[PDB]
């Protein structure tokens, strides 16, 4: 049930703002950072929404005006799409799949340019959609630098130390239009996902649901993304999607969602909820040291096999036929 | 067409002595050792029957009486079976497949014991079948040692040198009853197969027919053997067996069949042809050094993947499910 905003400002959002899907879900726990149960969850690589870390406390005031004024003159990657779905793709892998035609294009622009584009669409009632996704770097301005420095490093550093994680590799700034969706995928890093403006519905699936989510081949540009179209699932090609079960939540300003490494996640900015802003914190996982093997370890194994085969055969397109040749009449 | 034996002794064998199968074949070339075409074939890892190497010239006089008298008091492995089919199995791998029940059993005995058993079966009109298969070693007697030393080492050593092969690992003595069959399999060594007494029909398939022959899993005791029952093929489990095409020949005393590493072979002692005797020469292949990859190289790759997965998962029985999980909805 949607939470009530302090001061009797009503419900933060309602059901009608959620897209509808074919699968059930259970709620991710929302807990205080001081609650031992939250620590148990993170330690165990299970998701949890933390309500009071103050992780990005100083960014809570951010909005397009403040960012345009302070974020510098660096370039920003902005994706453009004609659908609500922003399927991630790896440009470096495009050569090996000449027939893949991305539904979204990346354009580099200045922040003011991004803001202007958002304005032109609104005014012209256009259907175009934009999603800015850009790692925070040295070119940001003074005020932003001050804000960044005011993040709760004390808490997040203890988290990094307590779990044996590797280094912070980056913080991605995500600014999206209402209704935008990042389709289901898994990342190979641990993520603290800090919501700043607006509301995002996050649906997660554990690594042991690999069989139900059907990731693209490792050498395909959509490596790590699910092939299933959540809006129109093809149960013929992906029969086990009929067995998928999610853990869901809606995060708002101030909330931090722990998205554990290898966990699938589908993220959507609420319909009619305005622009969203998020900043993530990506950490390399702990080192690989016992049976029985964990689901995520098996996933690590499958990726490696695919990778080795691709190199050994000299053509990634030869990966499938060999695998098929290996199992038919033998293991299936 | 069956050859004519010197001195007008008639046909060496006839069609009625061949078992019947569902697939077609083409003849393997029979050539003189001095013929350049024979050298081209071996160089290219293609089968050839050499008619005049004199490779085991001194063994042409061997028969059960001479061997019983001269082969020593060492132990001999003898397989016993109630079917004509002597499917090879690796005893060391039996623990990992508790449910595999071999159709043949191995018994160690003295040569005279083997000969006696052959006699008791004949006399008692029994249906039992025996196949002796034993590596030649130090315990053989003086006369046999003399015979072995008289093999044409000059020719076979040049062959080993010309092809870059590794060392002679062994020579297997095979003594079989008429009608015995060794079902289709591939060996990881190069083989010069020297026929001594009786006639054997040898049907070979190139390594690129892997998809049609359906070898057992690498960790299964029948690793390297085809799962298809040539006498009653199940086209439902093994549909591509309907596309298999063999290279066949019948070898007799004095002939040497080159069976190239990784080539499938099915070997049968002619029906009503009496006992057969053969001695093989197994050499390690040349070293692994260019695209496009050869069929046998791909086979090498598949074995390795299976092997690595088995070790990595800690249970070979987990190999299939992981592979299946890797391809369904992804590569198939």
């Amino acid at each position: 049930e949607p939470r009530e905003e302090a001061g009797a400002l009503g419900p933060a959002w309602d059901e009608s703002q959620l897209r509808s899907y074919s699968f059930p879900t259970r709620p991710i726990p929302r807990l205080s950072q001081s609650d031992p149960r939250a620590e148990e969850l993170i330690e165990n690589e299970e998701p949890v929404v933390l309500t009071d870390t103050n992780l990005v406390y100083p960014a809570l005031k951010w909005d397009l005006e403040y960012l345009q004024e302070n974020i510098g003159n660096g370039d920003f990657s902005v994706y453009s799409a004609s659908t609500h779905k922003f399927l991630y793709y790896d440009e470096k892998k495009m050569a090996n799949f000449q027939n893949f035609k991305p539904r979204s294009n990346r354009e580099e622009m200045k922040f003011h340019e991004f803001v202007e584009k958002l304005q032109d669409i609104q005014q012209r009632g256009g259907e175009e959609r934009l999603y800015l996704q850009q790692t925070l770097n040295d070119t940001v301005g003074r005020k932003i630098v001050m804000d960044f420095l005011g993040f709760n490093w004390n808490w997040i550093n203890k988290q990094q130390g307590k779990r044996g994680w590797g280094q912070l590799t980056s913080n991605l700034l995500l600014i999206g239009m209402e209704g935008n969706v990042t389709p289901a995928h898994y990342d190979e890093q641990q993520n603290f996902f800090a919501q700043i403006k607006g509301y995002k519905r996050c649906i997660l699936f554990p690594p042991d649901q690999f069989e139900c989510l059907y990731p693209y081949p490792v050498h395909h540009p959509c490596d790590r993304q699910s092939q299933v179209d959540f809006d129109n699932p093809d149960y013929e090609r992906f029969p086990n999607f009929q067995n998928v079960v999610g853990y869901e939540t809606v995060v708002g300003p101030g909330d931090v969602l722990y998205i554990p490494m290898y966990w699938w996640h589908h993220i959507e900015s609420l319909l009619n909820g305005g622009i969203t802003i998020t900043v993530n914190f990506w950490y390399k996982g702990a080192p690989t040291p016992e049976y029985p093997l964990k689901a995520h370890q098996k996933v690590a194994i499958m990726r490696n096999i695919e990778k080795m085969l691709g190199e050994a055969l000299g053509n990634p397109q030869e990966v499938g036929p060999l695998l098929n040749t290996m199992i038919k009449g033998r293991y299936n | 067409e069956p050859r004519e034996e010197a001195g007008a002794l008639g046909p060496a064998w006839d069609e009625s002595q061949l078992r019947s199968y569902s697939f077609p074949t083409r003849p393997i070339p029979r050539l003189s050792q001095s013929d350049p075409r024979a050298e081209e074939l071996i160089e290219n890892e293609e089968p050839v029957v050499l008619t005049d190497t004199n490779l085991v010239y001194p063994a042409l006089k061997w028969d059960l009486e001479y061997l019983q008298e001269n082969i020593g008091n060492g132990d001999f492995s003898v397989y016993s079976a109630s079917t004509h089919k002597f499917l090879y199995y690796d005893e060391k791998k039996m623990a990992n497949f508790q449910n595999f029940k071999p159709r043949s059993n191995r018994e160690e005995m003295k040569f005279h014991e083997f000969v006696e058993k052959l006699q008791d079966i004949q006399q008692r009109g029994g249906e039992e079948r025996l196949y002796l298969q034993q590596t030649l070693n130090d315990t053989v007697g003086r006369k046999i040692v003399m015979d072995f030393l008289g093999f044409n080492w000059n020719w076979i050593n040049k062959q080993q040198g010309k092809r870059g092969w590794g060392q002679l690992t062994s020579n297997l003595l095979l003594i079989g009853m008429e009608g015995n069959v060794t079902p289709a399999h591939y060996d990881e060594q190069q083989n010069f197969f020297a026929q001594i007494k009786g006639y054997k029909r040898c049907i070979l398939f190139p390594p690129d027919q892997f998809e049609c022959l359906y070898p057992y899993p690498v960790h299964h005791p029948c690793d390297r053997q085809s799962q298809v029952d040539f006498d009653n093929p199940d086209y439902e489990r093994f549909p591509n067996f309907q596309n298999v095409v063999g290279y066949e020949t019948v070898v007799g005393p004095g002939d040497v069949l080159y069976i190239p590493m990784y080539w499938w072979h099915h070997i049968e002692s002619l029906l009503n042809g009496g006992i057969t005797i053969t001695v093989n020469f197994w050499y390690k292949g040349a070293p692994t050094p260019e695209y496009p990859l050869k069929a046998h190289q791909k086979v090498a790759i598949m074995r390795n993947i299976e092997k690595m997965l088995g070790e990595a998962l800690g249970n070979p029985q987990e190999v299939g499910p992981l592979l299946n999980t890797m391809i369904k909805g992804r590569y198939n």
Binding site: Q133, N137, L168, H185, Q189, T288, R303 | A312
Partner: peptide, 22 residues
Amino acid sequence: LTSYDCEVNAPILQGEELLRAL
């Protein structure tokens, strides 16, 4: 085999380096 890389839905100063520099 059990070893893993660090790929995510973003291309490869930032992270730890950004922070320390600041």
